[PDB]
């Protein structure tokens, strides 16, 4: 996927539109990604899972990778990504600035 | 086959534990192994002296989960009896 | 098989034609005969057609 684990992304569609957060986990096979503080769900857990209350946990659920855009760290804005080889090494590049990653 | 591959694993059950008290140890062995080969394998592996080896074939047992049904793998169970004045096997 | 060792003549299928032209399958056989002949210098009994023998080139040891 064009996005990676640990990247800073902005949500461009969905209820959490315009939020930003770090990619906690990436699932290329599903083409999905989890962004901290994004797409949070209340899950009714039985106390069987070593939590001696079960309770209603809050956790982020994955969203499709196409619904987020990588935040250009230099500028703080979301941008599309091109691929340019630098010093013989291929890396991502912000199309809006040319900054790397 | 290789002597180390002849013996697969021990068998731990109530019957096997009673056998241990009698100084007889139960193993699962390669299904193609004969009790003479098992005797050789046990001696080399454990440094014990084997008095006798009794051997059985355990038939594949039918099982099922949900919509799927099949059989557990066939097994070959050997009860190895050590001579007196022979070191014990330790597990 | 029952085949002329030299000309290859072999049983085939023919027809019977009555005066009413009724057709029924039959077997047409070559006139084979057991003959002791020299193959590679060693005599042997093989099937041979009378036609193959007619020329006389086929040995008759």
């Amino acid at each position: 996927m064009f996005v990676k684990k640990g990247d800073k992304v902005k949500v461009i569609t969905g209820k959490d539109k315009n939020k930003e957060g770090v990619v906690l986990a990436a699932f290329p096979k599903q083409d999905k990604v989890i962004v901290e503080g994004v797409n949070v769900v209340k899950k009714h857990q039985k106390p069987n899972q070593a939590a001696p209350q079960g309770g209603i946990l809050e956790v982020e659920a994955p969203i499709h990778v196409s619904n987020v855009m990588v935040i250009d760290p230099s500028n703080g804005e979301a941008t599309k990504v091109a691929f340019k080889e630098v010093d013989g090494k291929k890396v991502r590049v912000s199309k809006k600035t040319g900054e790397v990653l | 086959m290789e002597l180390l591959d002849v013996i697969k694993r021990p068998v731990i059950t109530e019957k096997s534990m009673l056998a241990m008290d009698e100084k007889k140890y139960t193993f699962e062995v390669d299904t193609r192994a004969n009790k003479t080969l098992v005797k050789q394998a046990v001696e080399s592996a454990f440094d014990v002296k084997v008095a006798n080896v009794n051997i059985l074939n355990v038939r594949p047992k039918f099982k099922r989960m949900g919509k799927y049904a099949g059989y557990t793998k066939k097994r070959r169970k050997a009860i190895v009896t050590l001579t007196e004045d022979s070191k014990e096997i330790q597990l | 098989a029952k085949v002329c060792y030299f000309t290859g003549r072999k049983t085939s299928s023919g027809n019977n034609r009555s005066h009413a032209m009724n057709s029924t399958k039959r077997t047409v056989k070559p006139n084979l005969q057991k003959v002791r002949v020299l193959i590679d210098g060693k005599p042997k009994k093989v099937w041979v057609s009378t036609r193959a023998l007619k020329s006389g080139k086929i040995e008759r040891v």
Partner: protein
Amino acid sequence: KVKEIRELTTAEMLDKEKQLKEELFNLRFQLATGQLENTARIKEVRQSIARIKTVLREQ
């Protein structure tokens, strides 16, 4: 690993295989009881033996 196996010699490789076979044997026994924790070690040892045999054959 494969580099080490290639570095070793014929007798060293055979002896290493025997040690690995005994280790795999002991691992099976410990798994049959509850005394085995690093279960992945079983597959690691099996693949080590496979690498050793592959190198031996291609010598």
